[PDB]
Amino acid sequence: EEASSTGRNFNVEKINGEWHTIILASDKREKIEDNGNFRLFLEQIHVLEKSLVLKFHTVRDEECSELSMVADKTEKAGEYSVTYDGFNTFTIPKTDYDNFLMAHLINEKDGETFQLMGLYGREPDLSSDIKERFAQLCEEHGILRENIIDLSNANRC
Ligand code: NA
Ligand code: NA
Ligand code: NA
Ligand code: NA
Ligand code: NA
Residue 126 · residue 119 · CB < 8 Å: yes
Q: Which amino acid is at 125?
A: D
CATH value at residue 147 = 2.40.128.20
DSSP state of 3: B
- Residues 120 and 49: their CA atoms lie apart, in Å, by 22
Task: For residue 138, report the distance from its CA to the centre of ligand 5, in Å.
Answer: 9
Query: What separation, in Å, do the N-terminal and C-terminal C-alpha atoms of the chain show?
Result: 32
Query: For residue 22, which ligand has an atom nearest its CA?
Result: 4
DSSP state of 122: S
Element (H, E) at 154: none
∠ CA 98-15-150, nearest 5°, is: 70
Residue 58 · residue 78 · CB < 8 Å: no
Question: What contacts 111, CB < 8 A, 6 or more positions away?
Answer: none
Task: For residue 104, report the distance from its CA to the centre of ligand 2, in Å.
Answer: 7
Q: How many domains does the chain have?
A: 1
Residue 65: give the domain boundaries: 1-157
Task: For residue 122, report the distance from its CA to the centre of ligand 4, in Å.
Answer: 12
Within 13 A of 40's CA, how many CA atoms are on the CB side? 24
Resolution (A): 1.8
